[PDB]
């Protein structure tokens, strides 16, 4: 039987590329999405056309609330319903926007940013573990220690994610569950961001003066879930072209 | 006029020692507390007996909820009402218990642990900043963030989040002359509930003296960070751990 | 044409497994050795028997001295003479013994330990770069660099220096398309000398499987780093440690 | 009787400020120097004029060689001869220049840079320890993980220094010897550096858009050698105005 993976926020960009590449390796995948139903289903179609009954979608808001544990339990449950197993969890979905210290309410901002980048991954990890080459891969940030100005809540989520990656690695190791991280520097830049500001980030990158493709990020995930990484756990691999190494 | 400091969870242990020592340096202090009303008021009395009208208590639950921003705003507002200013904020209050991955609900656990160690400090930072000398924030971190004790995922996440905030706030508030730093105890005063044999096992682990830090030794670093001897220091986290974090398994 | 790799200290253990696995991927390899001529030549035979003219040995002492630059230049030159190119450098060779602060001279201890773990890698990096497709350097680091063994100061300094080189070379050589990365074993193949009970004490420490990494598992990460699956990776150090570095004292 | 400190490279800049401030706290000091004899003795006079027989100079090259252990032993020995004790060692002296990967020989470059920033501190630590509120303070670099371009050998020394700080801390703690570090971002800039380059670095600094004075660096050293840091060991305090936190 083929192994099965959950990728959260898998409709677009890096999430999609992870899901595709996992599928190409031989995984059956649950494409999680929140608002991008059209794109999520489109990908399920494309993947099922390649091999039948190997892709399903699952809708859930990963914002922190009273229903979030239940929601995360249901994401893991859908992988078991569809595929009879869950071998891999990739924590990709992430809310990302400025929260300056000085029209959402701040408690919504907290809920979305800490919820998506930290709490959901935590609850998903709990369920993944409860329900059992098993491994979890969290998408981190090579820039966590050199954050962007006014992104404190996001940066807190990403720092919390580092903490979870290490803590889960440690606690789940007796279960043969490896927990690791992939940390993009600048990859696909926000679709909204103007081309000029995209270029300013690109010039910063030592290796090639460009962003990572989503496939290059996916490559590291693929390595981390493979048998070439059986001893690797609690490791966060920067895939950043040397960006985090550049001084101000 | 004397400067003024907010210390969260200041009724006992490390919080109390920070509040006392700040007071001894010449700060007027707001003793924040949650359940320890008796001990918080006791400390206010002791400090006011030393110098009149220099200590006040403030009650607030720092659990995450939609009203926590309002609560945190009111803590900072309490310092301005009492003392007419707020020069220092020490983020000390912290929920601490295991949350294994494998009778509180998890939603409560998340709220208490992430709320106390990260979200409250974030909101308190927001208010401190907006309400504005030598201004500085000091967050109590964990020298063991990267070698967490088993099954303390939620706590460890808060503390990691605290590291992120310490650095992010440092960076954002530096144009306001507000320094943001951290003090990172290894093992200090161990939980009152913890058995003595368990306490000893941690003590033996410590390279420098095979003992825990006194609350005073933790406070000392805070005092340094708020002083003029640290005017250029920001986004720094000082381990006060006796070398614990350096010891391999 | 097949690409070519230099692996230093490749006669035994982790170095041999790296060299073997690079060869199995399709690299022609220079087996560097110091003392282990018999084993180095044995591996060259084994590899050449598999594919003819794809393995050569290269003898050099990597101890620091005024002739080490020349020696390191000659190792890189040996790969160009044999194979007409040099696509990959793996910095594996490493002296490893205690140097307590409190019968070699300390001069020799410095030279061996800092020489092998830092200065040779630096000089080899220099020559690799100067003599110039998917070009990359891989340095064997230490997942325990921040929780060192007792009395291993000189070794630990070399390994910390190696971290510095990994990052600095990454940064400087990136305009040349040369990626510099690291693989950091926790406990892998333990010293042949070490008693079995001491070996077991380390093994029990490991969260993932309570065992050491095989040399093959270390090699696997090197293979990943040199591959096209890591084209955007540089200045990254991948722990291959079974969670060891995460375990508190 | 008053405690005694060795400060290496104490004739100018940060070294001088450390030595002065230690003296002001009540230490007798050994001003080590290499080329700056005039400035070193000038400071000895200034300090002895303040309190008699409290300052001595000490000439030594800290370049790596087969005589360096002997030289380092003699620096520590001079403090014992002068003052009958040695309570504090401050590892400040440091060679600093580019060593690009692509007219000194490279073996000299290695010897100066690794010798000054790492090996001398190592040997001085050895002697300090063997000869016995005792503590060692090493001058590190807040930018060690975001190095300047082409400063590989320097950066290696500084990283080696981090290793030594932590390893000595751990090994010397049973002797009551605390080992810690002070990590300047941008402090006093090289005298040679032009003013506009100096400004480019200054603008990078979040806290005040200026470099640290030598005194601000010295303040942290003073804290680390004091009774207010009795439990602190293997800690490296950044004194960098937030510089290391700024992304490219
Ligand atoms: N791109 C980069 O340069 C970069 C750099 C560093 C780290 N990373 C990390 O890599 C991961 C992927 O990056 P990316 O740029 O592809 O991210 P992204 O497009 O910004 O977000 C990925 C997906 O997350 C989902 N999401 C957002 N808010 C959600 C919520 N409240 N509940 C449930 N799902 C939600 C969205 O799903 P729907 O569209 O279906 O609504 C979105 O498509 C993220 O974790 C990111 O932080 C990226
Ligand atoms: N002690 C150590 O070995 C150690 C080690 C590393 C880091 N630290 C950090 O240093 C700080 C102080 O340590 P400690 O041992 O003194 O802490 P603690 O006694 O466990 O907690 C300090 C105070 O936090 C307050 N608190 C707890 N939950 C709260 C909530 N939901 N809302 C508002 N306040 C709440 C409590 O106030 P009330 O009593 O009034 O209810 C408590 O007295 C903490 O941040 C801790 O994480 C300590
Ligand atoms: N094994 C582990 O648990 C572990 C853990 C962390 C990091 N690492 C790192 O991974 C790498 C390989 O580990 P290992 O255990 O396989 O290493 P090792 O056997 O101790 O050393 C590898 C080789 O280095 C060569 N070497 C030693 N001194 C030399 C000198 N002065 N000049 C030239 N070559 C010299 C030796 O070659 P000859 O035999 O031919 O003389 C030796 O075979 C090392 O860099 C090590 O520090 C290993
Ligand atoms: N300045 C900064 O922005 C900055 C930033 C980060 C870290 N740091 C660290 O802080 C410390 C002091 O900084 P600094 O700018 O004051 O240093 P510096 O002026 O560049 O060097 C200090 C002294 O080191 C001595 N020295 C150099 N090479 C030597 C050798 N081969 N043998 C013996 N002594 C030698 C020199 O003594 P003589 O003049 O007598 O010959 C020099 O005066 C250094 O460790 C430095 O790396 C400084
Ligand atoms: N979830 C997620 N999505 C991302 O697109 C992302 N990007 C990065 C690296 N990218 C960025 C992207 C934008 C800015 C930034 O300044 N963003 C402003 C856009 C300003 C503009 O568009 O002019 C923002 O509003 O988000 C910083 C880092 C890191 N983590 C991410 N995480
Ligand atoms: N807020 C806070 N309070 C602390 O007491 C504290 N202590 C440490 C270091 N202390 C500890 C204390 C207990 C355990 C632990 O195993 N605690 C179990 C107690 C087990 C027992 O008492 O037998 C627990 O239930 O908390 C780990 C680290 C770190 N951060 C802290 N943070
Ligand atoms: N080059 C290298 N070789 C290694 O074997 C090695 N091993 C580790 C992890 N291994 C170790 C091995 C031994 C000791 C240790 O206590 N060694 C004593 C042996 C004591 C005994 O054998 O009883 C020694 O003398 O080396 C610590 C960590 C890390 N880096 C390495 N680096
Ligand atoms: N020992 C030491 N001395 C320093 O002056 C020093 N300065 C810094 C921060 N300062 C610097 C200073 C210069 C350059 C730099 O680009 N230096 C060139 C000067 C170029 C010019 O002057 O135009 C050099 O040649 O050193 C980088 C960081 C960090 N560590 C130090 N360490």
Automatic annotation (TrEMBL), chains A, D:
Gene3D superfamilies listed in its UniProt record: NAD(P)-binding Rossmann-like Domain
UniProtKB keywords: Nucleotide-binding, Oxidoreductase
Residue(s) carrying Cysteine sulfenic acid (-SOH): 58, 72, 148
Residues at which NADPH binds: 13-14, 34-36, 61-63, 92, 94, 154, 158, 187-188
Pfam families, sorted: adh_short_C2 (PF13561)
InterPro entries: NAD(P)-bd_dom_sf, Pteridine_reductase, Sc_DH/Rdtase_CS, SDR_fam
Protein name: Pteridine reductase
Lineage: Eukaryota, Discoba, Euglenozoa, Kinetoplastea, Metakinetoplastina
Gene: PTR1
């Amino acid at each position: 039987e083929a192994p099965a993976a959950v990728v959260t926020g898998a409709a677009k960009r890096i999430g999609r590329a992870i899901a595709v590449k996992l599928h190409q390796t031989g995984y059956r995948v649950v494409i999680h999405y929140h608002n991008s139903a059209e794109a999520a289903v489109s990908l399920a179609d494309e993947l099922n056309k390649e091999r039948s009954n190997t892709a399903v979608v699952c809708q859930a808001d990963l914002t922190n609330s009273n229903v979030l544990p239940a929601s995360c339990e249901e994401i893991i449950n859908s992988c078991f319903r569809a595929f009879g197993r869950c071998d891999v969890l990739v924590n990709n979905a992430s809310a990302f926007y400025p929260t300056p210290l000085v029209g959402k309410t701040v408690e919504t901002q907290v809920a979305e940013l800490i919820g998506t980048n930290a709490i959901a991954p935590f609850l998903l990890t709990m369920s993944f573990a409860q329900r059992q080459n098993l491994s979890i891969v969290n998408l981190c940030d090579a820039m966590v220690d050199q954050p962007c100005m006014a992104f404190s809540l996001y940066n807190m989520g990403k720092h919390a994610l580092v903490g979870l990656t290490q803590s889960a690695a440690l606690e789940l190791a007796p279960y043969g569950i490896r927990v690791n991280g992939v940390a993009p520097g600048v990859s696909l830049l926000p679709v909204a961001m103007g081309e000029e500001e995209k270029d300013k980030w690109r010039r910063k990158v030592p290796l090639g003066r460009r962003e990572a493709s989503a496939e290059q990020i996916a490559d590291a995930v693929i390595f981390l879930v493979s048998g070439s990484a059986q001893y690797i756990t609690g490791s966060i691999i920067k895939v950043d072209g040397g960006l985090s190494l550049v001084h101000a």
